[PDB]
Amino acid sequence: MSEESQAFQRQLTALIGYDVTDVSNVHDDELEFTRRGLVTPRMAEVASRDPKLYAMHPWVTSKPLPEYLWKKIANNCIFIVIHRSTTSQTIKVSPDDTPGAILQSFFTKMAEQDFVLRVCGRDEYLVGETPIKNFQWVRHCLKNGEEIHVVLDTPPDPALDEVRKEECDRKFRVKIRGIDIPVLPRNTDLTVFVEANIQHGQQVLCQRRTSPKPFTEEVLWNVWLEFSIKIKDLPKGALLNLQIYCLLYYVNLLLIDHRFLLRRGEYVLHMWQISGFNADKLTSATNPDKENSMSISILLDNHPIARAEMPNQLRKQLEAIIATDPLNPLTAEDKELLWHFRYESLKHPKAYPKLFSSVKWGQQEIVAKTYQLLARREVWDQSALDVGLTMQLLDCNFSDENVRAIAVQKLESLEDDDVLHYLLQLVQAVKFEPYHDSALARFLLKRGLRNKRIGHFLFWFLRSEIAQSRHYQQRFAVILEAYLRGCGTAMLHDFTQQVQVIEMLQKVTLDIKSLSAEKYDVSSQVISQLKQKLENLQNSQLPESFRVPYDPGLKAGALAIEKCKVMASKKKPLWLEFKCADPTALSNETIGIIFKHGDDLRQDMLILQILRIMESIWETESLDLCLLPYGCISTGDKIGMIEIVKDATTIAKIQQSTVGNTGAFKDEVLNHWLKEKSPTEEKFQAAVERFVYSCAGYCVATFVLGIGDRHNDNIMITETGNLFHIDFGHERVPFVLTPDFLFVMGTSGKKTSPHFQKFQDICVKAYLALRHHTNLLIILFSMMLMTGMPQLTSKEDIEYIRDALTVGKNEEDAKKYFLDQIEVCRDKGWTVQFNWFLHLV
Numbered sequence: 108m109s110e111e112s113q114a115f116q117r118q119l120t121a122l123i124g125y126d127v128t129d130v131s132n133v134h135d136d137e138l139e140f141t142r143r144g145l146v147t148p149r150m151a152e153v154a155s156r157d158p159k160l161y162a163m164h165p166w167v168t169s170k171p172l173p174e175y176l177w178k179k180i181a182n183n184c185i186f187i188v189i190h191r192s193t194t195s196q197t198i199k200v201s202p203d204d205t206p207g208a209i210l211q212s213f214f215t216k217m218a219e220q221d222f223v224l225r226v227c228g229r230d231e232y233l234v235g236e237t238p239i240k241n242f243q244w245v246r247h248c249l250k251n252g253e254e255i256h257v258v259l260d261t262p263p264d265p266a267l268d269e270v271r272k273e274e275c276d277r278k279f280r281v282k283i284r285g286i287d288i289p290v291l292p293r294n295t296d297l298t299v300f301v302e303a304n305i306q307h308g309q310q311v312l313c314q315r316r317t318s319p320k321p322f323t324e325e326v327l328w329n330v331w332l333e334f335s336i337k338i339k340d341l342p343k344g345a346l347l348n349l350q351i352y353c354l355l356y357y358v359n360l361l362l363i364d365h366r367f368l369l370r371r372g373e374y375v376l377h378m379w380q381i382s383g384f385n386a387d388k389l390t391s392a393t394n395p396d397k398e399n400s401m402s403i404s405i406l407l408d409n410h411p412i413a414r415a416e417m418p419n420q421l422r423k424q425l426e427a428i429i430a431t432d433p434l435n436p437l438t439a440e441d442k443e444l445l446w447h448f449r450y451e452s453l454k455h456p457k458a459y460p461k462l463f464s465s466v467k468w469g470q471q472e473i474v475a476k477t478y479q480l481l482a483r484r485e486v487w488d489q490s491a492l493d494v495g496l497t498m499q500l501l502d503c504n505f506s507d508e509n510v511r512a513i514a515v516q517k518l519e520s521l522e523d524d525d526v527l528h529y530l531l532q533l534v535q536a537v538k539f540e541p542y543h544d545s546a547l548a549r550f551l552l553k554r555g556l557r558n559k560r561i562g563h564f565l566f567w568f569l570r571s572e573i574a575q576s577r578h579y580q581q582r583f584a585v586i587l588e589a590y591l592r593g594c595g596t597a598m599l600h601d602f603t604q605q606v607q608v609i610e611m612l613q614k615v616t617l618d619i620k621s622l623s624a625e626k627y628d629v630s631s632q633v634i635s636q637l638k639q640k641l642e643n644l645q646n647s648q649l650p651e652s653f654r655v656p657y658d659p660g661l662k663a664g665a666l667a668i669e670k671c672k673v674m675a676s677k678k679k680p681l682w683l684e685f686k687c688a689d690p691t692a693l694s695n696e697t698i699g700i701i702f703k704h705g706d707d708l709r710q711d712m713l714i715l716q717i718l719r720i721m722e723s724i725w726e727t728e729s730l731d732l733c734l735l736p737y738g739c740i741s742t743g744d745k746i747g748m749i750e751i752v753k754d755a756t757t758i759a760k761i762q763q764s765t766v767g768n769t770g771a772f773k774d775e776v777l778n779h780w781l782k783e784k785s786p787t788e789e790k791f792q793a794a795v796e797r798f799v800y801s802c803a804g805y806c807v808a809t810f811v812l813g814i815g816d817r818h819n820d821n822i823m824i825t826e827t828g829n830l831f832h833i834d835f836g837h838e839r840v841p842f843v844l845t846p847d848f849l850f851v852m853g854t855s856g857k858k859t860s861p862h863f864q865k866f867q868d869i870c871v872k873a874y875l876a877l878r879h880h881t882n883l884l885i886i887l888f889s890m891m892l893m894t895g896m897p898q899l900t901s902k903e904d905i906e907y908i909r910d911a912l913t914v915g916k917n918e919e920d921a922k923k924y925f926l927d928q929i930e931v932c933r934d935k936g937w938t939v940q941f942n943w944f945l946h947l948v
């Protein structure tokens with residue numbers, strides 16, 4: 108390597124948080140093979156992308172402009188203000204106008220083709236052949252009733268984006284020699300055995316055990332486990348799962364490797380423990396900690412890898428099967444039915460998941476017929492993209508390259524707008540890939556290199572996992588390094604600044620938790636310290652500026668120390684606020700961010716993101732439920748940052764405001780509070796207006812996910828009437844619709860107001876509109892559970908959501924069912940709200 112070539116990797120490693128060159132936690136070369144694998148897709152994409160558009164990353168959408176935003180223009184005319192030094196002219200514009208089309212208009216109307224229309228305050232540009240109606244920023248503006256302010260400045264230089272110059276029939280069998288652990292201790296000497304399983308996509312193909320022996324730090328068997336599957340019947344991506352019961356430890360090994368070579372020889376694998384089903388169990392990675400872990404020792408010794416129409420009534424039997432949720436499990440009679448009629452099943456795209464689950468992948472001949480089936484793909488290829496189907500075929504139930512590859516094929520037609528919607532879940536879905544290199548891994552790579560916004564979020568999502576997942580940090584690290592090597596020095600520089608900032612801040616956050624009561628209230632001595640230490644960074648540490656990781660358009664400047672604090676929580680998160688480093692920004696409002704250690708924010712991200720998906724699903728049907736999914740990025744182990752929504756108050760505090768007698772609750776306060784924060788009667792009804800939708804919004808969403816049973820503290824509202832929930836870190840009620848809410852709406856205990864009619868009316872559309880994507884939500888959710896929560900019941904836990912969405916019912920029985928939830932609120936008022944801790948001591 109070149110000397111300076113090695114100062115780079117060094118750079119890359121500290122941007123990643125893992126050393127992708129290290130080879131001390133491998134027993135083969137699949138990861139290095141995969142660094143090399145991706146060089147071609149990396150370069151292929153770097154080469155093909157437009158320098159000048161990649162530079163500006165215009166945020167754009169082909170979707171139609173929703174009905175609700177259409178009424179927001181009663182004139183087929185849009186007002187775009189333009190700024191240059193002092194003065195600023197305003198220009199009438201048409202929804203269909205174009206950036207070029209108005210730079211030209213601007214010059215004409217003025218008593219040249221080498222500038223650009225940027226936004227004030229942001230690195231967000233209005234550039235390229237898009238209708239102005241189709242720029243995200245513009246659609247966001249019309250929503251909130253804000254003028255569209257744009258500065259005329261010169262395009263950024265593609266030079267800065269430059270990328271550094273790239274330089275038998277034998278039954279299979281396995282010999283278990285022994286296990287070994289440095290220190291077992293627990294209590295009683297329960298016997299112990301191994302469980303050797305041959306798995307494909309969680310499907311078990313075969314199973315064997317060893318004579319149970321009482322637990323001792325060393326245990327030797329020398330035993331050959333004689334499997335039933337034939338060496339030649341082994342399918343690609345087939346794991347030898349090895350397990351230790353007394354379930355204490357597990358480890359995996361791909362039996363067929365990354366060059367289609369059957370595995371062979373001695374292996375000494377270091378096993379993972381079990382914390383007092385989920386995707387960590389599937390990992391091909393071994394435990395880096397070779398000092399404390401249990402160890403299994405094994406030996407392989409065993410290469411290649413080369414008409415008629417249905418009756419009228421089975422057809423119906425089949426169509427029934429195909430017409431059922433992603434969970435409703437298949438019986439052998441189902442499975443044999445889908446298979447005998449592979450070809451009729453193939454004419455229906457929605458059958459595909461179920462159909463490829465009906466494959467016996469422990470048989471060369473039947474896998475072989477499957478690929479023939481995949482060959483003749485005319486009908487799948489033609490179909491519209493169902494992100495649901497696509498995702499179901501990427502989950503843990505499929506471990507065949509070819510199945511998975513045809514799903515990723517289907518993603519290719521997603522525009523960035525949508526890639527951003529599903530990016531997080533796709534990145535988590537990489538966990539279910541048998542092999543480090545993969546269609547999906549290469550697709551995520553392509554799309555981040557093609558679009559700086561996707562590149563940005565892709566970086567954090569990957570860095571988030573590497574940082575806190577030993578099971579997958581290796582595989583993800585290889586993919587990030589892949590990314591980082593083609594994003595350009597422009598971006599590499601932003602990531603370096605961002606990584607600096609957050610690391611300094613995370614120092615400050617933990618040092619503050621250590622110095623404070625186990626929970627009780629911030630001392631004055633903390634307020635001193637916190638402000639003191641921030642100033643101690645504000646000088647010659649904190650970089651000048653940095654992109655806000657949850658909003659990469661926004662560049663934070665210097666801290667506003669006066670406005671910083673430690674939050675009186677229980678953990679001690681930081682309430683930090685920054686000046687905006689952009690002078691062009693037509694405001695003085697700071698950029699608030701919270702920094703928390705002690706909550707696993709990955710759950711929060713996952714939830715915030717589903718929330719976004721919901722908001723776009725209602726977009727498809729012309730509905731706007733005014734959610735407020737604030738930004739929240741996970742950065743490390745139980746540690747990350749959070750956006751501060753401006754001018755929002757907890758509902759707890761608006762109640763607790765008036766005495767706040769631990770729980771004496773009054774129905775009047777909210778509506779009063781709104782008028783206080785509303786100077787004119789005008790802006791008030793607009794607040795009541797929003798509340799209705801915002802409230803309606805969260806009632807539906809919150810219920811569906813089964814996180815609707817929450818305390819006051821964790822629900823906030825803006826001075827401007829937007830209600831929202833927070834803190835989605837992990838008798839009853841369906842959701843929170845307290846009498847104080849209903850008061851704003853007009854009701855007061857088993858009555859009906861004009862606005863409450865409205866409320867119900869909204870909720871029902873919203874509930875119905877979501878059921879139009881039942882499949883989508885069931886798959887997103889269940890994937891959430893496997894890759895995001897603790898170890899879950901791969902039946903019991905997920906089952907809730909099916910019920911919530913009232914699967915297998917008509918719209919009436921379902922609308923009814925929801926209205927009944929509305930009622931269980933009006934029957935319990937404050938009771939569990941009041942019950943929300945009456946427990947304290």
Ligand SMILES: Cc1nc(N)ncc1-c1nc(N2CCOCC2)c2sc(CN3CCN(S(C)(=O)=O)CC3)cc2n1
Pocket residue numbers: 672673674675676680682701703706708711737749750751752753755757823833834835836
């Ligand atoms: C902590 C946390 N963890 C997780 N995972 N998720 C969310 C939150 C979270 N986020 C908040 N945001 C501020 C508004 O924008 C959105 C975020 C707030 S405000 C609050 C009310 N408070 C403001 C006043 N103070 S104080 C005196 O500490 O400043 C009490 C807390 C508690 C709270 N908790």
